[PDB]
Amino acid sequence: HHPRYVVLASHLGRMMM
Amino acid sequence: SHRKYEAPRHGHLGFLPRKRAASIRARVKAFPKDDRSKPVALTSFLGYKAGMTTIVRDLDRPGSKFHKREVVEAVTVVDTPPVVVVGVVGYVETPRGLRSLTTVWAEHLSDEVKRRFYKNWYKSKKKAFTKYSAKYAQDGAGIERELARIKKYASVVRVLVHTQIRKTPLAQKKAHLAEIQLNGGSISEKVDWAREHFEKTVAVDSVFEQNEMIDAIAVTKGHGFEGVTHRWGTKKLPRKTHRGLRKVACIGAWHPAHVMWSVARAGQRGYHSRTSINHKIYRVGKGDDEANGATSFDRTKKTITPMGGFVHYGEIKNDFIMVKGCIPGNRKRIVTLRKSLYTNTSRKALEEVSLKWIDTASKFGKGRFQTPAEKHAFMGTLKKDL
Amino acid sequence: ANLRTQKRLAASVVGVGKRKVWLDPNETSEIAQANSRNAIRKLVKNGTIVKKAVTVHSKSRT
Amino acid sequence: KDVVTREYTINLHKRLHGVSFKKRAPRAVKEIKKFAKLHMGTDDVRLAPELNQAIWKRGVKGVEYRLRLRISRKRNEEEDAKNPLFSYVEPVLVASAKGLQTVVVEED
Amino acid sequence: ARYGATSTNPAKSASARGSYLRVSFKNTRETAQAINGWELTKAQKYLEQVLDHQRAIPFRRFNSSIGRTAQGKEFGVTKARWPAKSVKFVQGLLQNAAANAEAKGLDATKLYVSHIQVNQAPKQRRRTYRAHGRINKYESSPSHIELVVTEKEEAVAKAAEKKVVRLTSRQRGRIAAQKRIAA
RNA sequence: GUGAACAGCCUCUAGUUGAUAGAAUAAUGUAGAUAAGGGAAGUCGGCAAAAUAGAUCCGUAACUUCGGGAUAAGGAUUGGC
RNA sequence: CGUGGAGGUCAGUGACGAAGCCUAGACCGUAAGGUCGGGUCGAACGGCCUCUAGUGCAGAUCUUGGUGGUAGUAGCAAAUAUUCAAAUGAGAACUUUGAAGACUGAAGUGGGGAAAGGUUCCACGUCAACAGCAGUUGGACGUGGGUUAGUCGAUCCUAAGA
RNA sequence: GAAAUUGUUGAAAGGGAAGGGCAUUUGAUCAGACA
């Protein structure tokens, strides 16, 4: 069977602020 | 916002689209203006490009620093055997353009000109103008009634001429066919001249003179799909560019929200139809003349062909026209020469040229000798000599 | 004919590597019947399996 | 349609000019099969093992500029062979394989 | 033993079929459509030439992003290919169909492919491994194939309806008038 | 074997010849290169690449916790018989 | 109006075909829906008067299962490299044999072991599935054979510790 | 043995979407008063 997990997390940078 | 530093655009918008030409012949869009006063004569010619060589001559240009001094210039030779006239076509002026009205062919057409009407000659019955030739019959009423209509109605008369390919060294056996406009004389004299010249040849010396200025039309050398940097000369991106650096960075703004025709994009480079202008003739040689390459100041019996033959062409054995510089096209290709469309009175146009020496060292390398007799004198006997 | 096991046994019996053992290409049907180390030891005598010579490494230039 | 044998010379320089080094000897094999077809009209061409050694004598990228060959057109004895005839190429042992022109070899 | 829609006389046909065959369904459909309606002799020379690479199968529906070729000209198409593996299967079933026809006594010359169809079969499934430890599928696509060959015939239609005309009273008065004026 | 060297390169004993293939050689790529004249004018920044390099002989500054700096810097030689 | 079930009745329907499904075939109702013809099928279902409720779906990044367009598309491009002949076979670029050219290059692509796996070891038969191409080959599938100790280990002693 | 999705056969339409509402022309298909 196929176990699954959180795909990527992080590596999305940051925005506006 | 506005671009920070200005600069001219890359490329010319008058030469769009940059696509392959429809035919290997570049077509003569415009012929010289007519005046009925002079004699009948052709306005263009057909030839085959051969190669290039070098010329040394004096300069007759009062005022310039090099007046009465030697100068070395480049020239390109065009193999031009005589052309054969095989028909006449008449054009009427209509409110929505010119329009052909009749084509009258000759009786006997050579094999190499009727190869132009077959794709698979080797398995054909050679049925071409077979029924048309039975029109001359015993009287020729049909043919002479057709010519009557051209004299009556046509305002522009042209002539169909096919080049004698078999004489040139090309492996091709099919002969080109193109239309040349007749200038000079009444509409009556024009169609008579064509009829007398059916199956007859027209040599190059009867069209061009030595110091004329002419225009060349031919299809340029092809290269295939090409990137932006060598199709439009765009700047290259810095070294540290992800996803390539031979690309145009910005291909437009957010709005209009469509890529504009003015942007540089990759695609076909080469194989276009071009019309260069203002080329001065330097020699009108004769095929059956030895010492085609000699001059008043040289005086050595040698022909125009370098040692070992023009690379990728062969040897010249017919008439030829050498012009100052480059003409569009690559070697071996059909090239059509035209008379200029205006009277050029500049000093360059009127200058008369007398050559001093034509080059014949081999173009297949760093040639050192001009004649095989010159090689033997310098080197002396070798082992392979008797 | 699949004579892979015959090379293996031949190498140990003749006492060399598999790169140094020769099997006669015209005696396939004979070698195929040799499933014992006795049989391989009898073909070596016959000449159906021969020991290839060692490649030369001459010390002359040295 | 006839049993005929002949001797040729093949200029392998002009056929391997520009070819990648790891593919010079293999491609020469293919060109001797193309050459035998052009002259004998047999789709089935069998190269002798001794010819294979002549080609591969100097590694992948050491093919000889010219090779003298013997092409023999023969009959197919095999049942249900697609083609009645087939060719067979062998090497010819000579000091220098240049300066020679094609010539027929008599059966006996 | 039940086939698809057909309209030919069963007494003059012989059929063959094969099921659960591991060959691409998209390729095999193009192969079958190219033989549809041909005479049996012509189709079998045609397929042999596709293997020999002299002719090509015109690709019509399953043809997105494939290459162009000069051998689609005759079929009116610019994209075509040479499905080797799918030609062998269709080639095998035509041979079976010819064998059945001679068992029934049909005349081997008039046969033609009056029916051929391909539809999907249960998948065969596997696993592929992707970056970041993700599993996906790597399935196949088998196909069912069937066909029928029939004797050609010559039309013998006849005995059609007369289509009697029903005249009104006003019309019959006119027609009677025309008769009296002239014969 | 070469050499200071279980560096790099070639070979002997032994072991593999395993990684989907055939055909052409477009643009854009990844990896490896070379460029006339100028020589950092590029860039936030000599980022990247280049130039130096082994061994023998000569010569080696400021400063110094007197041990170092130091392979400073700068030159010359090198094959075969 | 429609659904599962319950009490009464129609002495209701049915293996001479109940329920279910399909039908640009028909009729009734504004509608929710009811009714009939045909084809498929094979065993139990409905009208009317009442009772009762786990009682009606287009959505919830809804739950489980099945299937598409993308699409015969992206792609199967690291580790220098393959080639000629015969044999076997329905079939050979990939198996077996022979000849050739190459590589690991003795801190190896060699020769053994420790932890860990558990029969993968060897033979015979064999190719539906697995070896992201192929296969006659295989660490695959079916069936069997195989691991011999007074001396090599465990066992015995003690270390941190229990 | 339903639906999604799919092959063949038959009918029809197709200038940068398809689908729907009112009305009729054309093609196909259905019922009948009937005595």
DSSP notation for B126-141: --SSHHHHTTSSSS-H
Q: Does a structural domain hold residue B215?
A: yes
What's the distance, Cα to Cα, between the start and end of chain E in Å? 65
Please give the structure tokens belonging to residue B79.
């193999």
Helix, strand or coil, per DSSP, at residue B374: helix
Residues B368 and B276 in one domain: yes
Asked if residue A1 belongs to a known ligand binding site, the reply is no
Q: Which nucleotide has the shortest C1'-to-CA distance from B266?
A: F27
What's the rounded Cα separation, in Å, for the pair E88 and D23?
Answer: 33
Cβ neighbourhood burial of E174 (10 Å; 0-12, 13-18, 19+): exposed
Taking CA atoms, E143 is separated from B141, D92, E27, E28, E84, in Å, by 73, 55, 10, 8, 15
What's the rounded Cα separation, in Å, for the pair E13 and E36?
Answer: 15
CB distance D73 to D5 below 8 Å = yes
Cβ neighbourhood burial of B215 (10 Å; 0-12, 13-18, 19+): buried
Amino acid at B344: N
Beta strands B273-285 and B320-324, pairing class: antiparallel
Residues B187 and B330 in one domain: no
Residues 6+ apart with CB under 8 A from D104: D4, D5, D6, D7
CB distance E7 to E82 below 8 Å = no
Cβ of A8 within 8 Å of Cβ of E132? The answer is: yes
Amino acid at B250: C
What's the rounded Cα separation, in Å, for the pair E161 and E158?
Answer: 10
Other residues' Cβ atoms within 10 Å of the Cβ of residue B16? 10
Residues B42 and B74 in one domain: yes
Of B383, B301, B279, give the one whose Cα is nearest residue B49. B279
Q: Does a structural domain hold residue B3?
A: no
Neighbours of chain D (3+ CB pairs under 8 A): none
User: What does B36-74 look like in DSSP terms, one character per residue?
Assistant: TTS--EESEEEEEEEEEEEEEEE---TTSTTTT-EEEEE
Please give the structure tokens belonging to residue B9.
């655009």
Resolution in A: 3.0
The answer to whether B244 CB is within 7 Å of strand F is yes
The single-letter DSSP state of residue B310 is B
Cis-peptide into B17, omega within 30 deg: yes
Residues 6+ apart with CB under 8 A from B286: B205, B292, B319
Helix, strand or coil, per DSSP, at residue B144: helix
Cβ of E135 within 8 Å of Cβ of A8? The answer is: no
Taking CA atoms, E50 is separated from D81, E75, E169, in Å, by 20, 14, 70
Q: Does a structural domain hold residue B234?
A: no
Residues B319 and B373 in one domain: yes
CB distance B45 to B216 below 8 Å = no
Question: Which CATH number covers residue B155?
Answer: 3.30.1430.10
Residue B53 forms beta bridges with which residues? B75
What's the rounded Cα separation, in Å, for the pair B9 and B326?
Answer: 26
What's the rounded Cα separation, in Å, for the pair D91 and C41?
Answer: 39
Residues in chain A with CB shorter than 8 Å from the CB of E133 are: 5
Residues B185 and B213 in one domain: no
Taking the CA of residue E136 and the C1' sugar atom of nucleotide G70, their distance in angstroms comes to 16
Cβ neighbourhood burial of B61 (10 Å; 0-12, 13-18, 19+): middle
Instruction: Provide the domain limits for residue C40.
Output: 3-51
Cis-peptide into B306, omega within 30 deg: no
What's the rounded Cα separation, in Å, for the pair E151 and E153?
Answer: 6
Asked if residue A4 belongs to a known ligand binding site, the reply is no
The answer to whether B225 CB is within 7 Å of strand F is yes
Residues B52 and B127 in one domain: no
CB distance B129 to B103 below 8 Å = no
φ, ψ at D70 (rounded to 5°): -125, 115
Residues in chain A with CB shorter than 8 Å from the CB of E126 are: none
User: What does C29-56 look like in DSSP terms, one character per residue?
Assistant: HHHTT--SHHHHHHHHHHTSEEEPPPPP
Query: Based on the structure, what is the number of domains in chain E?
Result: 1
CB distance E62 to E30 below 8 Å = yes
What's the rounded Cα separation, in Å, for the pair B233 and B7?
Answer: 13
What's the rounded Cα separation, in Å, for the pair E150 and E152?
Answer: 6
Strands of chain D (E only): list them. 5-11, 45-47, 66-75, 85-91, 103-104
Residues in chain A with CB shorter than 8 Å from the CB of E132 are: 7-8
Helix, strand or coil, per DSSP, at residue D39: helix
CB distance D50 to D90 below 8 Å = yes
Residues 6+ apart with CB under 8 A from B331: B49, B50, B51, B310, B311, B312, B313
In the numeric block, the tokens 């034509």 are attached to B358
The answer to whether E155 CB is within 7 Å of strand H is no
Nucleotides of H under 7 A from a protein CB: 6-9
Other residues' Cβ atoms within 10 Å of the Cβ of residue B139? 8
Taking CA atoms, B313 is separated from B50, B103, B363, B369, in Å, by 6, 35, 12, 21
The answer to whether E114 CB is within 7 Å of strand H is no
The single-letter DSSP state of residue B26 is P
Domain final position from B202, B232, B260: B202
CB distance C11 to C18 below 8 Å = yes
Can you tell me which residue has its alpha carbon closest to the C1' of nucleotide H9? E5
In the numeric block, the tokens 């002969």 are attached to B175
Per-residue three-class SS string for chain E: CCCCCCCCCHHHEEEEEEEEECCCHHHHHHHHHHHCCCEHHHHHHHHHHHHCCCCCEECCCCCCCCCECCCCCCCCCCEEECCHHHHHHHHHHHHHHHHHHHHHCCCCCCEEEEEEEEEECCCCCCEEEECCCEEEECCCCCEEEEEEEEECCCCCCCCCCCCCCCCCHHHHHHHHHHHHHCC
Taking CA atoms, E82 is separated from E39, E48, E146, in Å, by 21, 11, 21
User: What does B157-208 look like in DSSP terms, one character per residue?
Assistant: EEEEEEE-GGGSS-S--PPPEEEEEEESS-HHHHHHHHHHTBT-EE-GGGT-
H or E element at residue B248? none
Instruction: Provide the domain limits for residue B174.
Output: 82-202
Neighbours of chain E (3+ CB pairs under 8 A): A
Cβ neighbourhood burial of C10 (10 Å; 0-12, 13-18, 19+): buried
- What residue of A is the nearest CA neighbor of E134? A4
What's the distance, Cα to Cα, between the start and end of chain A in Å? 43
What's the rounded Cα separation, in Å, for the pair B319 and B204?
Answer: 7
Other residues' Cβ atoms within 10 Å of the Cβ of residue E35? 22
CB distance E162 to E124 below 8 Å = no
Taking the CA of residue B195 and the C1' sugar atom of nucleotide F45, their distance in angstroms comes to 82
- What residue of A is the nearest CA neighbor of E136? A2
Cβ of A2 within 8 Å of Cβ of E135? The answer is: yes
Question: Which CATH number covers residue C34?
Answer: 1.10.1650.10
Query: Based on the structure, what is the number of domains in chain C?
Result: 1
Amino acid at C28: T
Cβ of A7 within 8 Å of Cβ of E132? The answer is: yes
A positions 1-17 inside 8 Å of E (CB): 2, 5, 7-8
What's the rounded Cα separation, in Å, for the pair B251 and B249?
Answer: 6
Of D79, D97, D2, D90, give the one whose Cα is nearest residue D40. D2
CA B13 to chain centre: 25
Mutant choice from E135, E136, E138 vs A, greatest count of A C-beta within 10 A: E135
CA B227 to chain centre: 29
Q: Does a structural domain hold residue C56?
A: no
Residues 6+ apart with CB under 8 A from B40: B182, B183, B184, B185, B189, B190, B193
Q: Does a structural domain hold residue B249?
A: no
Taking the CA of residue C59 and the C1' sugar atom of nucleotide F78, their distance in angstroms comes to 29
Amino acid at B176: H
Other residues' Cβ atoms within 10 Å of the Cβ of residue B386? 3
